[PDB]
Amino acid sequence: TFRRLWPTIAPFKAGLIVAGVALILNAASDTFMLSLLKPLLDDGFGKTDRSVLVWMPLVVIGLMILRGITSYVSSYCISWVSGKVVMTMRRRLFGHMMGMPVSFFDKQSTGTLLSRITYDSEQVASSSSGALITVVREGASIIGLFIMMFYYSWQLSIILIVLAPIVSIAIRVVSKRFRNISKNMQNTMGQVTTSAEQMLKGHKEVLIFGGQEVETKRFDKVSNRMRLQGMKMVSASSISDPIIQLIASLALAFVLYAASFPSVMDSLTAGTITVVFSSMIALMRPLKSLTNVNAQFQRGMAACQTLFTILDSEQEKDEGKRVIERATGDVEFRNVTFTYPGRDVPALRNINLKIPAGKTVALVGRSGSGKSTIASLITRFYDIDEGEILMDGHDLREYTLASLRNQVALVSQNVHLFNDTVANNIAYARTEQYSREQIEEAARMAYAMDFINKMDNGLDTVIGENGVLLSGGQRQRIAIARALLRDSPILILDEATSALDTESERAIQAALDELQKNRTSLVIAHRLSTIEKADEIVVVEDGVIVERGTHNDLLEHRGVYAQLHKMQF
Amino acid sequence: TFRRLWPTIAPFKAGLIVAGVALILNAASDTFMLSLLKPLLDDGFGKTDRSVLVWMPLVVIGLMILRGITSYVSSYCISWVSGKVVMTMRRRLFGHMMGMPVSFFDKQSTGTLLSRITYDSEQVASSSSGALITVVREGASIIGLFIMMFYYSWQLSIILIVLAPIVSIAIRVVSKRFRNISKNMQNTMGQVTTSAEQMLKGHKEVLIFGGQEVETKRFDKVSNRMRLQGMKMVSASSISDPIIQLIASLALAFVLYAASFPSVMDSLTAGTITVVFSSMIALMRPLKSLTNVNAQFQRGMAACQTLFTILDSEQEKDEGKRVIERATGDVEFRNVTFTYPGRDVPALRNINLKIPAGKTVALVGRSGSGKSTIASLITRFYDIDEGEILMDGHDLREYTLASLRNQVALVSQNVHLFNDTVANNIAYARTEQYSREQIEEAARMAYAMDFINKMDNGLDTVIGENGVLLSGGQRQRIAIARALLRDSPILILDEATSALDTESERAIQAALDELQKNRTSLVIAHRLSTIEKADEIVVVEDGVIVERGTHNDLLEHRGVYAQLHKMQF
């Protein structure tokens, strides 16, 4: 559509208008240069002899310096307004995208999300700038050369611009008719091409059944047919150009025939014919851009509209408003049934799993589904389709989402470190609340003090991407140190890295043991040791808890856990 | 590259040379039109004489008629040239692929085989035509304008032509340097965009840790960073334009200054300088196309190389020179091992299957592995990789290809009909051998003559595509009619569809029975009736003939046939 959000661009409009003035001045310079062509021919030339001729190079080079500075300030100011709107738009996009849930980030768009952040975000400003500079400067050009025509030609310019629509409609209708004829022959050329297709398709039957001379003769016939068809359509397309050239030729022949002196015309001709013709041919392309600017503006505002739909999409529904300072209660599921958005099959039927306070619950039965979502529910990345998860005597969703969400800590195989100092990384979002000595102590009991000590600057070294790129195991240590500093009452572990590293498994296991010494813990590890240490074991084949209790009892009762014990070895 | 294809265009050298003289005449017409401004400017308007300005426009329109006829004969003659090159190329190509074995048609390229026959075949001729018109026409243009301003000025011409290379090297070096600048700033811009990429790659950690307030601050920082990078990359790219325009202006100013600074130029008159300026400006384009002629020629001859490698390929293996009039001998496999070319898995292991003369044998397999291609071995569509098949006590490879294909007749549910008459289709490439009365007599016992009897014009009506579009079952009926007339000693039935068409299934089955009533016949079939009628049953699951014997014998012994009997019902 045409609706736009002016207040996005409004505070910087000053830059826009100065850009605008520069553009018209630039256009004026070109117009002035075209005007400067006129005295160079008649007055500033062999009228008498070498007469002056020395105003021309200084004035043209000065005009060209003028055009240069105008282009410079135009580019600088249009870059200013475009970059500022890009800044504001991307800032608001992040602000209103973080609040939005993972429902978009569920592999819906990750590679093209970068298209969203940079490509179209720059493209909308680029297209708006292109349209604005084209409307202002081409329009200034049309006005300039029109006033030059009127000043230099009160008669010839009028008959010329009256003739212009006639020649344009003539060449347009001729081109349309010849293009229609070309399409008519395209149908028939496509037909004989399909005949040739039908011919070759039956290769096998051609070889097995008899000879091939009839095939060659027939293909000779159809080749001649399509050759004559190519003759006809090439002839039509070619003979389109000398006819439109002839129509323009008649238009031109009429323009100079107007110079056949009446009382109306030829009083003032001079050498002005060249400058007016130059004005016309230089007017040819600004009109083309003047008709393309509408398409450019529509494309730009269409990208704007798509980005607006990405923007104004609803955030996470923060209906809950019950604030909690500390979560000393136990985690319990109440027949929770979940359906994965975008997938017909439900991910999880009703489940009544209870995790008592200060206990370790390991989900051995990852099954084909994997059941990472079961931990995600406490994080509320995905909303609860049915059932409730009671928390200290109240529903999880009833609680203020920030309040509950800060209380839970997640550690997995992969943890995206931020491109800041390692000290910032451990105390991200809590730099003011926590202390540097507290971070140092957290690294101390994390049993990864060696890794942080190995850093060249240590506590304040940049750790994220475009840096040292620490090992995935080291990333796990950093995340667990984050968790220990947080002291989150709720703990959840994925622990997909069942592989044993260069003795970092020992330190990582010690870190898990220390973290789970207190506070609730629901772990999704493949580590049989974690199952042994775990107080309670659950397993789900995507439907329900198949086995419940201590792993020895689930080994005694066959069920499904026994097979997991066999494949665990 | 190139070095060939000249003998093909040799007989059309008359077309080449008439087109060339037409093109150079067109270039001379353009040069004359550019020259026509000098009488118009120096004398047409500036001078008090009036008859001169009405002298020239009739010459303008006449020159443009000349341009029109030259363009028309150019297009027509070069169309003759190109159409003939494509004619000869298509004919030689398809005559070659007649001989090229079926192994090439593996479905390696069938959709783009149409590209080979029309698209690239037209591209070679179109590129040759483009190079021929461009080199001759634009070269005549360079020669024409070079002679032109030399004739009109011995001084301004040389001074323009010596500064021109200086302008080109200056703008080239400036553009290249600023382009290298733009490239490295693009790299730095890419760095910050990758920073943004890792920022929003995962917000899940940002969500759970609730660092909403800090992520926006840091994104604002990096957004300002890439805004400044955009400022720098734009400023450089923008300021590249007025600088190169300034160097061009310096050249223009030098030309104007030297036009009358020394007393050597002297007589530039008034309009002649306009002729030189316009000549240079209109020479800029043909030089640009002169640059691209080499790229166009190499593209065309590369398409020619791709076209030629089809031509420069071995035909089907036709080492055999032994001829058979009627192959009354039996057909028998002896440990024949075959593999599909391009497939690593061995398709066919050794088989010792014997098909006695007169008697017919059957093979049924739902998987289709090896069943389809076992037929092709008798037809020698694909050469046997190892082993021998004895026709009349001699190998198939020993026998001549055409002789062997004459003896054997193929029938299948999918038979590509030809775009010729029904009479031509039944006797294809044999209408000279067999009489028209013989064709209708052949149709008589086929018991599918009913459709051709009710047909609009009887036996002579076109039947293939772009025509009647006969039904699939009736296409199979024409396939059977092809077989009765030949009375081939060897018969191979496919019967893949096994479709029960109401009242046409019975006629088709009866015709098949009559056709296979005599002569050696191998029948692939899922029909239990055809299986029962076969004298011997041999079933293959891509490994070996598993069960040999009658259907009752293959049912008493379980093997695999007892399994197929479950879905045969």
- Please give the C-alpha separations between residue B184 and each of B170, B171, B196, B225, B420, in angstroms, as whole numbers: 22, 20, 19, 16, 66
- The SS3 call for residue B488 is coil
Whether A327 and A391 have beta carbons less than 8 Å apart is answered as yes
d(CA A51, CA A39): 12
- The DSSP-derived string for A321-370 is -B--S---SPEEEEEEEEE-TT-SSEEE-----EE-TT-EEEEEE-TTT-
Task: Tell me the one-letter amino acid at A147.
Answer: I
CATH number of the domain at B33, please.
1.20.1560.10
B246 touches chain A (CB under 8 A): yes
Which of A60, A99, A231 is opposite residue B83, by nearest beta carbon? A231
Residue written as tokens 């020992």?
Answer: A506
Q: Which of B83, B154, B155 is nearest to B121 (CA)?
A: B83
B529 touches chain A (CB under 8 A): no
Same domain, B243 and B374: no
- Please give the C-alpha separations between residue A567 and each of A88, A523, A528, A549, A564, in angstroms, as whole numbers: 55, 19, 11, 20, 5
Torsion of CA B204, B210, B211, B215, to 10 degrees: 50
For β-strands B490-493 and B408-411, DSSP reports them as parallel
For residue A324, being part of any structural domain is answered with no
Whether B198 and A416 have beta carbons less than 8 Å apart is answered as yes
Q: Do A420 and B253 touch (CB under 8 A)?
A: no
Whether B415 and B478 have beta carbons less than 8 Å apart is answered as yes
d(CA B443, CA B484): 8
- All residues of chain B having their beta carbon less than 8 Å from the beta carbon of residue A112 are none
Whether B465 and B383 have beta carbons less than 8 Å apart is answered as no
Structural domain including A462 reads 331-568
d(CA A42, CA B460): 81
For residue A278, being part of any structural domain is answered with no
Q: Do B230 and A83 touch (CB under 8 A)?
A: yes
Q: Measured at the alpha carbon of residue A467, what is the angle toward residues A462 and A472, in degrees to the nearest 5?
A: 95
d(CA A548, CA A353): 9
- The SS3 call for residue A317 is coil
Mutate to test the interface with B, among A249, A254, A405, A478 (most CBs of B within 10 A): A249
State phi, psi for B354 to the nearest 5 degrees.
Answer: -115, 130
Task: Tell me the one-letter amino acid at B568.
Answer: Q
For β-strands A331-339 and A354-355, DSSP reports them as antiparallel
- The DSSP-derived string for B510-563 is HHHHHHTTSSEEEEE---HHHHHHSSEEEEESSSSEEEEE-HHHHHHS-TTHHH
- The SS3 call for residue A391 is strand
Same domain, A363 and A467: yes
d(CA B521, CA B526): 16
Mutate to test the interface with A, among B43, B70, B94, B316 (most CBs of A within 10 A): B94
CB neighbour list of residue A499: distance below 8 Å, 6 or more residues apart: none
- Give, for A61, the enclosing helix (H) or strand (E): helix A55-98
Q: What is the DSSP letter of A455?
A: S
Same domain, A206 and A233: yes
B264 touches chain A (CB under 8 A): no
Q: What is the DSSP letter of B333?
A: E
Q: Which domain-ending residue is among B250, B267, B284?
A: B267
- The SS3 call for residue B138 is helix
Tally Cβ neighbours within 10 Å of residue A307: 18
For residue A321, being part of any structural domain is answered with no
Provide, for chain A, the percentages of residues in helix, strand and coil under a 3-state DSSP scheme, each rounded to the nearest 5.
Answer: 60, 10, 30
Same domain, B147 and B159: no
- The SS3 call for residue A292 is helix
- The SS3 call for residue A521 is strand
Rg of chain A over all Cα atoms, to the nearest angstrom:
39
Burial class of B567 by CB neighbour count within 10 A (0 to 12, 13 to 18, 19+): exposed
d(CA B130, CA B297): 8
d(CA A19, CA A23): 6
Same domain, B128 and B52: yes
d(CA A332, CA A335): 10
Strand segments (E) across A458-532? 490-493, 520-523
d(CA A428, CA A447): 20
* Residues after which chain A is discontinuous, using a C–N cutoff of 2.5 Å: none
Mutate to test the interface with A, among B74, B112, B114, B207 (most CBs of A within 10 A): B207
The first and second tokens of residue B200, run together, are: 């929003």
Tally Cβ neighbours within 10 Å of residue B455: 16
- Give, for B255, the enclosing helix (H) or strand (E): helix B212-260
CA atoms within a 13 Å half-sphere pointing along the CA-CB vector of B439: 21
- Helix and strand numbers, DSSP H then E, in chain B: 20, 10
Residue B404 C-alpha, separation from nearest chain A C-alpha, in angstroms: 9
Experimentally, the structure was elucidated by cryo-EM
Same domain, A364 and A302: no
d(CA A455, CA B177): 40
Q: Return the HEC string of B468-486.
A: CCCCHHHHHHHHHHHHHHH
Is the Cα dihedral B337, B342, B343, B344 positive or negative? positive
Interface of B with A in 421-450 (CB under 8 A): 428-430
d(CA B325, CA B340): 31
d(CA A484, CA A479): 9
State phi, psi for A475 to the nearest 5 degrees.
Answer: -60, -40
CB neighbour list of residue B128: distance below 8 Å, 6 or more residues apart: B82, B85, B297, B300
- Please give the C-alpha separations between residue B39 and each of A266, B61, B76, in angstroms, as whole numbers: 17, 15, 34
Tally Cβ neighbours within 10 Å of residue A86: 21
Whether A290 and A139 have beta carbons less than 8 Å apart is answered as yes
Burial class of B176 by CB neighbour count within 10 A (0 to 12, 13 to 18, 19+): exposed
Whether A539 and A567 have beta carbons less than 8 Å apart is answered as no
CATH number of the domain at B371, please.
3.40.50.300
d(CA A136, CA A74): 12
| Chain centroid offset of residue A116 CA | 3
Whether B239 and A72 have beta carbons less than 8 Å apart is answered as yes
Same domain, B280 and B249: no
* Number of structural domains in chain A: 3
State phi, psi for B370 to the nearest 5 degrees.
Answer: 90, -25
Which residue of chain B comes nearest to A188, CA vs CA?
A: B466
CB neighbour list of residue B564: distance below 8 Å, 6 or more residues apart: B364, B366, B539
The first and second tokens of residue B181, run together, are: 């600048």
Residue written as tokens 């590259």?
Answer: B1
For residue B263, being part of any structural domain is answered with yes
Q: What is the DSSP letter of B348?
A: B
Whether B125 and B132 have beta carbons less than 8 Å apart is answered as no
Same domain, B372 and B459: yes
d(CA A242, CA A239): 6
The first and second tokens of residue A391, run together, are: 């928390």
For residue B321, being part of any structural domain is answered with no
Is the Cα dihedral B22, B25, B30, B33 positive or negative? negative
Same domain, A545 and A497: yes
- Residue ranges of the alpha helices (H) in B100-120? 111-114
d(CA A133, CA A77): 11
The first and second tokens of residue B156, run together, are: 């301004």
List the end-to-end C-alpha distance of chain A, in Å, as a whole number: 64
Whether A557 and A525 have beta carbons less than 8 Å apart is answered as no
- Give, for B217, the enclosing helix (H) or strand (E): helix B212-260
Q: Return the HEC string of B197-214.
A: HHHHHCCHHHHHHCCHHH
Q: What is the DSSP letter of B99?
A: H
Same domain, A94 and A182: no
Burial class of B112 by CB neighbour count within 10 A (0 to 12, 13 to 18, 19+): exposed
List the end-to-end C-alpha distance of chain B, in Å, as a whole number: 64
Q: Which of A93, A99, A103, A108 is nearest to A304 (CA)?
A: A93
CB neighbour list of residue A209: distance below 8 Å, 6 or more residues apart: B405, B409, B410, B428, B429, B482
The first and second tokens of residue B225, run together, are: 């960073």
Whether A90 and B225 have beta carbons less than 8 Å apart is answered as no
B202 touches chain A (CB under 8 A): yes
| Chain centroid offset of residue B208 CA | 57
Which residue of chain A comes nearest to B209, CA vs CA?
A: A406
- Residue ranges of the alpha helices (H) in A212-271? 213-238, 241-258
Whether B130 and B74 have beta carbons less than 8 Å apart is answered as no
For residue A33, being part of any structural domain is answered with yes
Q: Return the HEC string of B366-424.
A: CCCCCHHHHHHHHHCCCCCCEEEEEECCEECCCECHHHHHHHEEEECCCCCCCCCEHHH
CB neighbour list of residue B149: distance below 8 Å, 6 or more residues apart: B156, B157, B160, B275, B276, B279, B280
d(CA B376, CA A418): 65
Per the document, the length of chain B is: 569
Whether B474 and B448 have beta carbons less than 8 Å apart is answered as yes
Same domain, A348 and A432: yes
d(CA B304, CA B93): 12
- The DSSP-derived string for A359-373 is -EEEEEE-TTT---H
Whether B551 and B561 have beta carbons less than 8 Å apart is answered as yes
- Give, for B156, the enclosing helix (H) or strand (E): helix B156-201
Q: What is the resolution of this structure in A?
A: 4.1
Residue B189 C-alpha, separation from nearest chain A C-alpha, in angstroms: 11
Is the Cα dihedral B333, B335, B341, B347 positive or negative? positive
- All residues of chain A having their beta carbon less than 8 Å from the beta carbon of residue B241 are 71
For residue B320, being part of any structural domain is answered with no
Which residues sit opposite A385 in a β-bridge? none
State phi, psi for A553 to the nearest 5 degrees.
Answer: -65, -40
Residue written as tokens 């709107």?
Answer: A85
Tally Cβ neighbours within 10 Å of residue A512: 24
Strand segments (E) across A394-439? 394-395, 408-411
| Chain centroid offset of residue B435 CA | 40
For residue B58, being part of any structural domain is answered with yes
Whether A371 and A542 have beta carbons less than 8 Å apart is answered as yes
The first and second tokens of residue A181, run together, are: 């004829």
The first and second tokens of residue B547, run together, are: 């069960």
Largest separation between any pair of C-alpha atoms in chain B:
119
Task: Tell me the one-letter amino acid at A172.
Answer: R
Q: Do A271 and B41 touch (CB under 8 A)?
A: yes
Which residues sit opposite B72 in a β-bridge? none
Task: Tell me the one-letter amino acid at A516.
Answer: Q
Angle between helices A13-41 and A272-312 (to 10 degrees): 160
Q: Which of B461, B441, B466 is nearest to B451 (CA)?
A: B461
CA atoms within a 13 Å half-sphere pointing along the CA-CB vector of B223: 24
Q: What is the DSSP letter of B356?
A: -
- Please give the C-alpha separations between residue A225 and each of A228, A331, B453, in angstroms, as whole numbers: 5, 81, 32
Which residues sit opposite B153 in a β-bridge? none
Task: Tell me the one-letter amino acid at A432.
Answer: E
Q: Do A64 and B249 touch (CB under 8 A)?
A: yes
The first and second tokens of residue B329, run together, are: 């001998």
Q: What is the DSSP letter of A380?
A: T
Same domain, A164 and A227: yes
